[PDB]
Amino acid sequence: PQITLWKRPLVTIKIGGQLKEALLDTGADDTVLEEMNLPGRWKPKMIGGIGGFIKVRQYDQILIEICGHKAIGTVLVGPTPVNIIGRNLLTQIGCTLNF
Amino acid sequence: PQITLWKRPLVTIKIGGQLKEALLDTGADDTVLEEMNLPGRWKPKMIGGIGGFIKVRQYDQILIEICGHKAIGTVLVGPTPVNIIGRNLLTQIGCTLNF
Ligand SMILES: CCOP(=O)(COc1ccc(C[C@H](NC(=O)O[C@H]2CO[C@H]3OCC[C@H]32)[C@H](O)CN(C[C@@H](C)CC)S(=O)(=O)c2ccc([C@H](C)O)cc2)cc1)OCC
């Protein structure tokens, strides 16, 4: 689809069998979701934002369906203010900016 | 044009008579620019993201040219790590997400 930006580009995602709402975020290199339970191994990681760094749990090769488009990639889980879908997955679903 | 997301979507902007590099950021409601001494009145503001909040100065009705497309709106000036072009300006240049 074509998504305008007059409102936040929020979409429904399916991850670990659960539906959530997430923001399509071209300013984010990586994908960061709010605290949740995901199966499998994970490694601690640090990521920095506008206000500083947070500790996240890094889950690799995680299946995630974004607005009906499948992706399999890295998902960071931690105290982000909102679920954000970053470029690592936006590229997988073929998302581009156009003007 | 069309901008893929393999790399950060960095473009040249023109503001206050200066050229700068900025990030087209669909995850940002508003626009946040590096420290610059713009003329005119302003009001203090707090903006938050990953890692907490930072103090910024809010200037209104600022003209920015983004890839030759002009836009006029609010700009937040402060110690941001990157120049962030938010939806308030992206909408004015007709920017959309597409997949
Ligand atoms: C060399 C130093 O750089 P640095 O590492 C940080 O650099 C960066 C800092 C910020 C960004 C943009 C930010 N992306 C981001 O957080 O991405 C994280 C996850 O993926 C990684 O990729 C890049 C960083 C990591 C997002 O797109 C937009 N945000 C809102 C989003 C969280 C939804 C609520 S916002 O910025 O907070 C914001 C809030 C309010 C407004 C106005 C008021 O409406 C405007 C902007 C990109 C690079 O320093 C470490 C301290």
UniProtKB/Swiss-Prot annotation, chains A, B:
List of catalytic residues: D25
Residue segments, region Dimerization of protease: 1-5, 49-55, 88-99
Source species, domain of life: Viruses
Cystine pairs: none
Domain Peptidase A2, chain residue ranges per copy: 20-89
Residue stretches in coiled coil: none
Summary of subunit composition and partner proteins: Homodimer, whose active site consists of two apposed aspartic acid residues.
Designated name of the protein: Protease
